[PDB]
Write a protein that binds this DNA or RNA. Structure first.
Ligand SMILES: [Ca+2]
Ligand SMILES: [Ca+2]
Length: 220
DNA sequence: GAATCAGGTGTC
């Protein structure tokens, strides 16, 4: 309903939101949603279909590699910027979920906007839904992991699976709980088998060795 | 759905 005020001044406004910033595995997902024919139900009082039939949508992704090289915050806007880019209508303005985000289109940030703007409310759905059906095929591809349930998140299951099964190249290797399970041994193997770029290989080395450092200081 | 447990990272 706040979405309506912005449309009056800027005309074509979009909604951005992301999913999967707290995961241990997978990319981060973003979604950009221009929308006209209004939908009751999104931030009001089976709309997946209505949103698809009745809106403009761009989706962006950042590979887990990219979360590890760039970091979880930058990888996010990287996807978000790819969403606007993948969106078919150029908006004059954007309402982003969160705070402290500057995107390639002039915009404003809304705290709990995924819960007060319809355009963001839309993309936030789009985002999860895609991510979810993505984690699904990850589950099929990596049968050992219940990706289809925990969504790559840091649940008790997912951890046990990592511990019992080993880390994957689709794990965010710079993520504390994954990191703490990491041996350069594996890194090397991942590298040698061509399952990680040299860039990532280095980064993670530098990171492990830095993890030891703060423990070393902290032990003194 | 609202609470309440759990687990992630980022900027100021
Ligand atoms: Ca939220
Ligand atoms: Ca979201």
């Amino acid at each position: 309903g706040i979405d309506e005020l912005y449309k009056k001044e800027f005309g074509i406004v979009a909604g951005v939101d992301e999913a999967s910033r707290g995961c241990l595995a997978g990319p981060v997902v973003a979604a950009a949603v221009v929308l006209e024919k209004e939908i009751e139900g999104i931030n009001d009082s089976r709309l997946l279909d209505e949103i698809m039939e009745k809106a403009a949508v761009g989706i962006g992704i950042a590979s887990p590699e990219e979360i590890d090289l760039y970091n979880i915050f930058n990888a996010t806007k990287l996807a978000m910027n790819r969403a606007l880019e993948n969106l078919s209508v150029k908006p004059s303005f954007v309402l982003v979920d969160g705070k402290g985000i500057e995107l390639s289109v002039p915009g404003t940030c809304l705290v709990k906007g995924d819960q007060k703007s319809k355009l963001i409310g839309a993309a936030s759905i789009v985002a999860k839904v895609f991510r979810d059906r993505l984690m699904s095929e990850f589950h099929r591809m990596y049968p050992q992991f219940s990706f289809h349930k925990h969504k790559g998140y840091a649940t008790k299951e997912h951890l046990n699976e990592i511990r019992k099964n080993g880390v994957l190249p689709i794990h965010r290797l710079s993520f504390e709980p994954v990191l703490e399970l990491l041996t350069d041994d594996l890194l090397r193997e991942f590298f040698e088998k061509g399952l990680i770029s040299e860039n990532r290989f280095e980064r993670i080395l530098n990171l492990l060795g830095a993890r030891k450092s703060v423990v070393f200081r902290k032990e003194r």
